[PDB]
Design an enzyme around this catalytic site. Structure first.
Site, PDB file in Angstrom:
ATOM      1  N   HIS A 148       0.650  -1.390  -0.016  1.00  0.00           N
ATOM      2  CA  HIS A 148      -0.029   0.016   0.064  1.00  0.00           C
ATOM      3  C   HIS A 148       0.717   1.216  -0.107  1.00  0.00           C
ATOM      4  O   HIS A 148       0.245   2.158  -0.348  1.00  0.00           O
ATOM      5  CB  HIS A 148      -0.908  -0.049   1.227  1.00  0.00           C
ATOM      6  CG  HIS A 148      -1.876  -0.958   1.208  1.00  0.00           C
ATOM      7  ND1 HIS A 148      -3.195  -1.096   1.900  1.00  0.00           N
ATOM      8  CD2 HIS A 148      -2.056  -1.924   0.071  1.00  0.00           C
ATOM      9  CE1 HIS A 148      -3.866  -2.388   1.331  1.00  0.00           C
ATOM     10  NE2 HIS A 148      -3.286  -2.641   0.431  1.00  0.00           N
ATOM     11  N   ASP A 149       2.155   1.145   0.371  1.00  0.00           N
ATOM     12  CA  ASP A 149       2.910   2.579   0.354  1.00  0.00           C
ATOM     13  C   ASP A 149       3.573   2.601  -0.959  1.00  0.00           C
ATOM     14  O   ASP A 149       3.304   3.585  -1.600  1.00  0.00           O
ATOM     15  CB  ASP A 149       4.234   2.310   1.291  1.00  0.00           C
ATOM     16  CG  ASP A 149       5.047   3.581   1.326  1.00  0.00           C
ATOM     17  OD1 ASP A 149       4.512   4.368   1.149  1.00  0.00           O
ATOM     18  OD2 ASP A 149       6.297   3.306   1.395  1.00  0.00           O
ATOM     19  N   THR A 202      -1.127 -23.091   5.203  1.00  0.00           N
ATOM     20  CA  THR A 202       0.016 -22.648   5.921  1.00  0.00           C
ATOM     21  C   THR A 202       0.388 -21.319   6.143  1.00  0.00           C
ATOM     22  O   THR A 202       1.202 -20.858   5.258  1.00  0.00           O
ATOM     23  CB  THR A 202       0.812 -23.503   5.091  1.00  0.00           C
ATOM     24  OG1 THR A 202       1.146 -22.979   3.951  1.00  0.00           O
ATOM     25  CG2 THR A 202       1.044 -25.152   5.124  1.00  0.00           C
ATOM     26  N   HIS A 210       0.148 -14.000  -0.421  1.00  0.00           N
ATOM     27  CA  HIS A 210      -1.140 -14.427   0.288  1.00  0.00           C
ATOM     28  C   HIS A 210      -0.774 -15.916   0.521  1.00  0.00           C
ATOM     29  O   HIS A 210      -1.767 -16.144   1.173  1.00  0.00           O
ATOM     30  CB  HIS A 210      -2.164 -14.268  -0.886  1.00  0.00           C
ATOM     31  CG  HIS A 210      -2.738 -12.725  -0.923  1.00  0.00           C
ATOM     32  ND1 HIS A 210      -3.871 -12.764  -1.578  1.00  0.00           N
ATOM     33  CD2 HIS A 210      -2.428 -11.839  -0.504  1.00  0.00           C
ATOM     34  CE1 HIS A 210      -4.310 -11.307  -1.304  1.00  0.00           C
ATOM     35  NE2 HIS A 210      -3.386 -10.768  -0.775  1.00  0.00           N
ATOM     36  N   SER A 211       0.410 -16.423   0.656  1.00  0.00           N
ATOM     37  CA  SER A 211       0.607 -17.509   1.316  1.00  0.00           C
ATOM     38  C   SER A 211       1.010 -17.255   2.694  1.00  0.00           C
ATOM     39  O   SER A 211       1.171 -18.307   3.473  1.00  0.00           O
ATOM     40  CB  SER A 211       1.948 -18.213   0.472  1.00  0.00           C
ATOM     41  OG  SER A 211       2.341 -19.452   1.203  1.00  0.00           O
ATOM     42  N   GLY A 262       5.438   6.868  -4.717  1.00  0.00           N
ATOM     43  CA  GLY A 262       5.833   5.480  -4.478  1.00  0.00           C
ATOM     44  C   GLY A 262       6.498   4.975  -3.098  1.00  0.00           C
ATOM     45  O   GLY A 262       5.632   5.378  -2.155  1.00  0.00           O
ATOM     46  N   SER A 301       5.124   7.270   2.688  1.00  0.00           N
ATOM     47  CA  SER A 301       3.904   8.323   2.735  1.00  0.00           C
ATOM     48  C   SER A 301       2.854   7.933   3.697  1.00  0.00           C
ATOM     49  O   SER A 301       2.113   8.587   4.342  1.00  0.00           O
ATOM     50  CB  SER A 301       3.715   8.878   1.415  1.00  0.00           C
ATOM     51  OG  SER A 301       2.845   7.834   0.740  1.00  0.00           O
ATOM     52  N   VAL A 314       3.818 -20.448   6.420  1.00  0.00           N
ATOM     53  CA  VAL A 314       5.023 -21.050   5.656  1.00  0.00           C
ATOM     54  C   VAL A 314       4.893 -20.394   4.382  1.00  0.00           C
ATOM     55  O   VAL A 314       3.989 -20.440   3.881  1.00  0.00           O
ATOM     56  CB  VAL A 314       4.969 -22.736   5.519  1.00  0.00           C
ATOM     57  CG1 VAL A 314       6.127 -23.162   4.779  1.00  0.00           C
ATOM     58  CG2 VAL A 314       4.937 -23.425   6.921  1.00  0.00           C
ATOM     59  N   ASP A 327       7.994   5.664  -0.802  1.00  0.00           N
ATOM     60  CA  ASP A 327       8.399   6.903   0.093  1.00  0.00           C
ATOM     61  C   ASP A 327       8.044   6.997   1.462  1.00  0.00           C
ATOM     62  O   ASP A 327       8.599   8.099   2.185  1.00  0.00           O
ATOM     63  CB  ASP A 327       7.856   8.012  -0.909  1.00  0.00           C
ATOM     64  CG  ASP A 327       6.388   8.385  -0.743  1.00  0.00           C
ATOM     65  OD1 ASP A 327       5.666   7.517  -0.434  1.00  0.00           O
ATOM     66  OD2 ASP A 327       5.771   9.073  -1.388  1.00  0.00           O
TER      67      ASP A 327
HETATM   68  C1  HEM Z   1      -4.339  -7.695  -6.678  1.00  0.00           C
HETATM   69  C2  HEM Z   1      -3.961  -7.020  -5.238  1.00  0.00           C
HETATM   70  C3  HEM Z   1      -4.337  -7.299  -4.074  1.00  0.00           C
HETATM   71  C4  HEM Z   1      -5.671  -7.433  -3.554  1.00  0.00           C
HETATM   72  C5  HEM Z   1      -7.037  -7.033  -4.367  1.00  0.00           C
HETATM   73  C6  HEM Z   1      -5.411  -7.714  -2.114  1.00  0.00           C
HETATM   74  C7  HEM Z   1      -6.513  -7.535  -1.295  1.00  0.00           C
HETATM   75  C8  HEM Z   1      -6.474  -8.163   0.229  1.00  0.00           C
HETATM   76  C9  HEM Z   1      -7.371  -8.082   0.990  1.00  0.00           C
HETATM   77  C10 HEM Z   1      -8.780  -7.778   0.779  1.00  0.00           C
HETATM   78  C11 HEM Z   1      -6.876  -8.628   2.146  1.00  0.00           C
HETATM   79  C12 HEM Z   1      -7.464  -8.749   3.507  1.00  0.00           C
HETATM   80  C13 HEM Z   1      -7.341  -7.596   4.309  1.00  0.00           C
HETATM   81  C14 HEM Z   1      -8.087  -7.636   5.751  1.00  0.00           C
HETATM   82  O1  HEM Z   1      -9.313  -7.564   5.688  1.00  0.00           O
HETATM   83  O2  HEM Z   1      -7.601  -7.989   6.749  1.00  0.00           O
HETATM   84  C15 HEM Z   1      -5.443  -8.946   1.988  1.00  0.00           C
HETATM   85  C16 HEM Z   1      -4.598  -9.526   2.889  1.00  0.00           C
HETATM   86  C17 HEM Z   1      -3.167  -9.604   2.577  1.00  0.00           C
HETATM   87  N1  HEM Z   1      -2.460  -9.203   1.656  1.00  0.00           N
HETATM   88 FE1  HEM Z   1      -3.347  -8.603  -0.166  1.00  0.00          FE
HETATM   89  N2  HEM Z   1      -4.178  -8.143  -1.967  1.00  0.00           N
HETATM   90  C18 HEM Z   1      -3.472  -7.949  -3.108  1.00  0.00           C
HETATM   91  C19 HEM Z   1      -2.027  -7.817  -3.302  1.00  0.00           C
HETATM   92  C20 HEM Z   1      -1.054  -8.277  -2.345  1.00  0.00           C
HETATM   93  C21 HEM Z   1       0.377  -7.895  -2.469  1.00  0.00           C
HETATM   94  C22 HEM Z   1       0.864  -7.647  -3.942  1.00  0.00           C
HETATM   95  C23 HEM Z   1       0.732  -7.998  -1.113  1.00  0.00           C
HETATM   96  C24 HEM Z   1       2.198  -7.849  -0.830  1.00  0.00           C
HETATM   97  C25 HEM Z   1       3.398  -8.136  -1.456  1.00  0.00           C
HETATM   98  C26 HEM Z   1      -0.125  -8.574  -0.294  1.00  0.00           C
HETATM   99  C27 HEM Z   1      -0.222  -8.822   1.001  1.00  0.00           C
HETATM  100  C28 HEM Z   1      -1.257  -9.256   1.926  1.00  0.00           C
HETATM  101  C29 HEM Z   1      -1.087 -10.023   3.097  1.00  0.00           C
HETATM  102  C30 HEM Z   1       0.455 -10.402   3.561  1.00  0.00           C
HETATM  103  C31 HEM Z   1      -2.160 -10.027   3.596  1.00  0.00           C
HETATM  104  C32 HEM Z   1      -2.630 -10.573   5.108  1.00  0.00           C
HETATM  105  C33 HEM Z   1      -2.711  -9.667   6.114  1.00  0.00           C
HETATM  106  C34 HEM Z   1      -3.173 -10.282   7.582  1.00  0.00           C
HETATM  107  O3  HEM Z   1      -3.259 -11.535   7.583  1.00  0.00           O
HETATM  108  O4  HEM Z   1      -3.411  -9.311   8.488  1.00  0.00           O
HETATM  109  N3  HEM Z   1      -1.426  -8.428  -0.955  1.00  0.00           N
HETATM  110  N4  HEM Z   1      -5.082  -8.543   0.499  1.00  0.00           N
HETATM  111  O1  BHO Z   2      -5.647  -4.751   1.070  1.00  0.00           O
HETATM  112  C1  BHO Z   2      -6.625  -4.048   0.134  1.00  0.00           C
HETATM  113  N1  BHO Z   2      -5.948  -4.243  -0.959  1.00  0.00           N
HETATM  114  O2  BHO Z   2      -4.665  -4.559  -1.259  1.00  0.00           O
HETATM  115  C2  BHO Z   2      -8.009  -3.908   0.239  1.00  0.00           C
HETATM  116  C3  BHO Z   2      -8.533  -4.292   1.408  1.00  0.00           C
HETATM  117  C4  BHO Z   2     -10.108  -4.001   1.702  1.00  0.00           C
HETATM  118  C5  BHO Z   2     -10.644  -3.318   0.613  1.00  0.00           C
HETATM  119  C6  BHO Z   2      -9.943  -2.789  -0.382  1.00  0.00           C
HETATM  120  C7  BHO Z   2      -8.512  -3.160  -0.813  1.00  0.00           C
HETATM  121 CA    CA Z   3       1.577 -20.751   2.919  1.00  0.00          CA
HETATM  122 CA    CA Z   4       3.786   5.754  -0.621  1.00  0.00          CA
END
Ligand code: HEM
Ligand code: BHO
Ligand code: CA
Ligand code: CA
Ligand SMILES: *[C@@H]1O[C@H](CO)[C@@H](O[C@@H]2O[C@H](CO)[C@@H](O)[C@H](O)[C@H]2NC(C)=O)[C@H](O)[C@H]1NC(C)=O
Length: 336
Positions: free
Chosen positions: A48-49, A196, A176-177, A67, A71, A199, A69
């Site tokens: 997000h940053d 996992t 997301h792993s 980017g 912010s 992991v 930064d």
């Molecule tokens: C196509 C873009 C992506 C979308 C739409 C997306 C969306 C989301 C959403 C909705 C959650 C759950 C947030 C919550 O309710 O707690 C999530 C969790 C997460 N995302 Fe993504 N994500 C994307 C890409 C990424 C990328 C590129 C990374 C980092 C390199 C990332 C890392 C994470 C991590 C580690 C979690 C888990 C957070 C937790 O367990 O508290 N995501 N993502």
């Molecule tokens: O984490 C997110 N995108 O990475 C996200 C989470 C909730 C709503 C919209 C976007």
């Molecule tokens: Ca995993």
């Molecule tokens: Ca930023």
């Protein structure tokens, strides 16, 4: 060499302060070098940053974001009001205090904490770490972060504007792993996205391809899809990216080898870490990052499901032979 006060050896003088913030983060922020919620929240924060960067806005005469930064910390008062940034305030404040106390820039600190956090999770690659990003930033423009209800075209266009190809979008999602959700369906707080959550492995790519069979909570949350077994949460964008013809073959290729997955993820993260900067103006301090313990488990289709339960979506490559497991269908506990 440049010998740092603590006797460690490093490439450059500028790397020595990072051994002090390493000790602080491992002892305090990560509670004894653990791979739990602080690591998962910092991975969501680095994305997000950095993604608050848009060449298209710059082209139209508007400020497009700086980017990677920092912010999101310096201007948290405006960026944490964005819909995509919920559930992050407590981690942001913790990081703010470390940055102030150590005298390092907020953009550098977020990249450093991502590399150190991942080293606590088995199976992780060693991420590159560069220092020198200016501490000066402007607030990110709104609406630059992809959401779980967006179409695949919308995600690919946003990510492409920032500079990523469709393949790199699939590669970046290896994060997301190590993931759960907290705000999409609060009734099943911290339901993991794969079996996992501690992991860094291929299970996320395998399990999002399995037929959606199960509703894990009492109702469906925002952008929630049926998942393959009790306790696992499936968000719509992951389900759609696994199946769409523009991303399906790269997604399927990520299922059989943790080694290829790690290499591709490390490269995409190195590119994301310098959005808004010229990496030739930064100093390489990657030797400060410690290794993760290795993951010795092979990829598996869990709980008695077979290849007949996966919805193969890449019409050109046959699905890889992945090991099957016995036992009943698993029920996942919340991520720690
Ligand atoms: C196509 C873009 C992506 C979308 C739409 C997306 C969306 C989301 C959403 C909705 C959650 C759950 C947030 C919550 O309710 O707690 C999530 C969790 C997460 N995302 Fe993504 N994500 C994307 C890409 C990424 C990328 C590129 C990374 C980092 C390199 C990332 C890392 C994470 C991590 C580690 C979690 C888990 C957070 C937790 O367990 O508290 N995501 N993502
Ligand atoms: O984490 C997110 N995108 O990475 C996200 C989470 C909730 C709503 C919209 C976007
Ligand atoms: Ca995993
Ligand atoms: Ca930023
Ligand atoms: C990076 O810039 C931020 C300001 O945007 C600085 O943060 C402030 O630091 C002071 C004194 O250290 C604190 O009292 C303020 O509360 C901080 N403000 C915010 C918004 O966090 C930070 O000190 C700068 N860091 C460096 C190394 O220059």
């Amino acid at each position: 060499s440049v010998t740092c006060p603590g006797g460690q050896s490093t490439s450059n003088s500028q790397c020595c302060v990072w051994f002090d913030v390493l000790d602080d983060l491992q002892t305090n922020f990560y509670q004894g070098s653990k791979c739990e919620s602080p690591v998962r929240k910092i991975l969501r924060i680095v994305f997000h940053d950095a993604i608050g960067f848009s060449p298209a806005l710059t082209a139209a005469g508007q400020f497009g974001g700086g980017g990677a930064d920092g912010s999101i910390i310096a201007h948290s008062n405006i960026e944490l009001a964005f819909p995509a940034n919920g559930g992050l305030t407590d981690t942001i404040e913790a990081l703010r205090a470390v940055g102030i106390n150590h005298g390092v820039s907020f953009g550098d600190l977020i990249q450093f904490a991502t590399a150190v956090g991942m080293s606590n999770c088995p199976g992780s690659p060693r991420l590159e770490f560069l220092t020198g990003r200016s501490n000066s930033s402007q607030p990110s423009p709104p609406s630059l972060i992809p959401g779980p209800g967006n179409t695949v075209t919308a995600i690919l266009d946003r990510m492409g504007d920032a500079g990523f190809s469709p393949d790199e979008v699939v590669d970046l999602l290896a994060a997301h792993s190590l993931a759960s959700q907290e705000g999409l369906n609060s009734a099943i707080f911290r339901s993991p996205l794969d079996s996992t959550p501690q992991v860094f492995d291929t299970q996320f790519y395998i399990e999002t391809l399995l037929k959606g069979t199960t509703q894990p909570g009492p109702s469906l949350g925002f952008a929630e899809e049926l998942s393959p077994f009790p306790g696992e949460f499936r968000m719509r964008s992951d389900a759609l990216l696994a199946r769409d013809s523009r991303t399906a073959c790269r997604w399927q290729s990520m299922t059989s080898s943790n080694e290829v997955m790690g290499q591709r993820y490390r490269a995409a993260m190195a590119k994301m870490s310098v959005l808004g900067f010229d990496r030739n103006a930064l100093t390489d301090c990657s030797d400060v990052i410690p290794s993760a313990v290795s993951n010795n488990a092979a990829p598996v289709i869990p709980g008695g499901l077979t290849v007949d339960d996966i919805e193969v979506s890449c019409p050109s490559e046959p699905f890889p032979e992945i090991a099957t497991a016995s036992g009943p269908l698993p029920s996942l506990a919340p991520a720690p």
